[PDB]
Ligand code: HEM
Ligand code: HEM
């Protein structure tokens with residue numbers, strides 16, 4: 081049981097709860113950003129500067 | 142006119158996702174706390 | 190000409206406080222007169238009024254009402270506070286008149 | 291006593307065959323209820339959190355003197371015997387009770403209390419002029435963190 | 437260590453109306469008066 | 481003494497007696513959320529305003545440029561300007577619903593609370609008025625010009641009253657610097673009066689939709705309304721963040737992107753949306769002095785609401801006649817908002833004159849009349 085164990089190990093003690101929030105936020109940020117940036121970049125394929133960047137540098141100038 | 146055009150909409154995406162998540166969670170927590178009152182029943186029993 | 194009774198009975202249903210199981214005098218706004226008249230109410234009527242109000246309050250926070258069966262009929266509405274309220278007002282008008290003369 | 295919180299308060303552990311009722315009961319004036327309930331729930335948390343060896347060294351001595359006082363006469367001995375068989379299946383001598391009790395320490399009291407009390411949804415019965423004490427949610431939040 | 441507690445409202449002071457749940461109380465002795473360090477006050 | 485240090489601590493005490501142990505009616509709805517919204521919105525506007533002010537330059541030769549520099553060079557300055565500008569609209573949306581609630585649920589009978597409310601509204605309008613001049617665009621200057629030039633309609637004292645407020649003979653640098661100082665100052669007055677606004681409220685506590693004594697069923701503010709408000713916050717904050725991060729320039733005049741030029745009058749000088757209803761009433765009376773009075777009366781009329789209550793019941797919940805009459809007034813205000821955004825030509829002229837006429841008629845005449853007519857149908 082994940083629910084039961086998530087309670088007793090994390091959510092029960094107020095100290096362990098707060099640490100979960102911090103630890104969970106650090107992981108959430110790292111994930112949510114990369115995901116959001118990915119969803120946005122795909123929705124604009126070939127439109128951004130990072131896409132057309134190869135024409136004017138890092139290969140020819 | 143607005144060089145922030147790209148980042149503004151990129152933020153709008155992050156906002157809408159976060160806002161959707163947080164609004165839902167807070168709605169449960171509200172309903173959870175208010176469940177005590179929402180389900181509460183009462184009776185009028187005098188020594189009539 | 191049974192028109193006046195037609196109009197009152199219509200407004201009573203259009204008002205819809207009977208849906209909450211409230212008497213007409215339950216919905217009375219408690220100004221200085223109503224407050225005084227309430228204190229003159231017999232224990233039984235007062236304790237009953239208290240429940241009806243607390244029930245309407247509980248219903249209101251539930252966004253629910255009473256079943257149609259439990260709605261106060263227009264002809265079954267007890268004006269329990271109105272006789273008290275009229276004397277409270279009559280007494281006050283006397284003092285206000287007696288203090289001018 | 292210091293704050294005139296109640297006329298009386300008692301703690302009980304009413305046990306049944308497969309269940310029980312660990313809790314407390316108090317009698318108070320209409321305007322001293324909330325402060326009384328506040329302190330009471332605080333001491334419950336103090337059980338699960340802060341219980342010292344010094345405290346239980348006294349508590350054990352009281353419980354020892356209690357179970358012995360329980361057997362003062364023929365009727366209270368007969369009552370114990372008639373109940374011990376009916377509930378335990380046997381007689382538990384005061385000698386055995388003492389052995390169980392004397393093994394109790396502060397670390398154990400904290401654990402057992404944290405098991406039955408901490409962050410548990412309690413049962414509440416309130417009778418009389420009870421305005422100052424209100425909302426289950428507030429009472430429920432008094433069940434965690436001392 | 438034993439005995440049940442009580443409490444009433446003063447200034448004016450704060451189970452005795454049957455034939456049996458009121459019975460057992462009709463003065464056999466006179467009137468003893470107890471008070472304790474940690475036990476409820478009693479009376480006979 | 482007192483047991484805990486939550487009921488004792490003179491700082492934590494009014495923190496406790498306002499946001500923790502404060503008795504509230506069990507049945508107040510979402511229409512009671514906009515109070516705490518206005519509170520947070522005020523603290524939001526002040527913060528976003530401070531951040532903007534740290535990059536603003538109060539001078540007619542640098543005002544427009546400094547604001548532009550803030551959006552273009554300051555890190556997330558484009559956003560802080562975005563939030564502060566649209567946040568001013570969130571303020572008025574919440575305050576119009578806050579007011580509309582009280583008018584519908586008879587909350588104005590808390591006269592001290594209600595009167596401090598009107599004053600809070602008046603200070604807010606003045607605050608947003610002087611803040612609009614700060615970017616010093618075309619609509620900024622000419623909005624300030626048209627409105628302040630009205631005071632000259634006052635006989636004798638008038639034409640001096642204007643040139644004093646201007647600090648000159650027209651809206652210029654002496655006017656911008658004092659408007660910035662005024663725009664910086666006023667929100668702190670709003671903060672202070674709010675504390676008075678809440679103080680008068682805590683005398684009687686909150687009203688409820690039914691309008692009857694809620695002493696029979698009170699609940700602690702926390703957690704019931706502490707949670708309810710936060711929900712109502714994120715519920716209301718999503719459309720405006722959507723507004724501010726997808727269509728930021730939706731509400732405002734594009735004329736404010738053209739730097740202020742005293743030698744070119746914009747074709748259609750209209751205010752922001754929350755002033756439109758008042759602007760329409762202003763232009764209903766062709767006379768300049770009458771228009772000013774009609775404008776002032778349109779908002780000052782709120783002071784007369786408590787004295788125009790004739791109904792035996794507090795709210796409008798059990799008053800179907802007053803209900804539709806209420807919604808007529810709400811629709812009336814929409815028609816006024818629409819008229820104000822349109823040029824002064826037929827048929828907009830006569831429509832505006834009638835809508836503004838009915839506005840005062842409903843509040844002054846029909847509302848106390850219908851209320852009386854209702855009481856006799858209740859057999860009183
Ligand atoms: C910056 C402006 C304002 C702030 C910060 C503010 C704040 C609040 C808060 C927090 C409440 C309690 C919660 C609620 O009832 O919604 C309240 C209630 C109230 N406010 Fe305001 N308010 C403002 C403007 C106004 C205005 C413009 C009016 C009237 C024209 C007003 C009149 C009232 C009344 C009558 C109540 C009592 C409502 C009730 O309990 O039924 N306030 N206010
Ligand atoms: C209730 C509080 C406030 C309201 C209603 C308000 C309203 C406004 C409005 C409508 C504008 C016009 C901006 C635009 O449309 O382009 C503005 C601009 C501005 N305000 Fe405020 N404001 C408030 C608080 C503050 C505070 C407290 C400060 C400073 C301490 C401040 C500083 C500024 C500055 C620097 C600008 C210029 C930036 C710009 O024009 O976008 N504001 N304000």
Ligand SMILES: CO/C=C(/C(=O)OC)c1ccccc1CSc1nc2cc(OC)ccc2s1
Nearest residue numbers: 605606608609612623624749750751752755758
């Ligand atoms: C500096 O002008 C500001 C205007 C505006 O809409 O500000 C948000 C504006 C722009 C164009 C045309 C008209 C206006 C203001 S209309 C108006 N402005 C006000 C200001 C008040 O403060 C007490 C009260 C009532 C009213 S009615």
Ligand SMILES: CCCCCCCCO[C@@H]1O[C@H](CO)[C@@H](O)[C@H](O)[C@H]1O
Nearest residue numbers: 117148151152155156159160163721
């Ligand atoms: C309830 C409202 C929550 C809104 C959360 C918005 C978080 C925005 O986060 C921002 O996103 C930008 C776009 O990638 C980044 O450039 C910024 O570094 C980042 O701070």
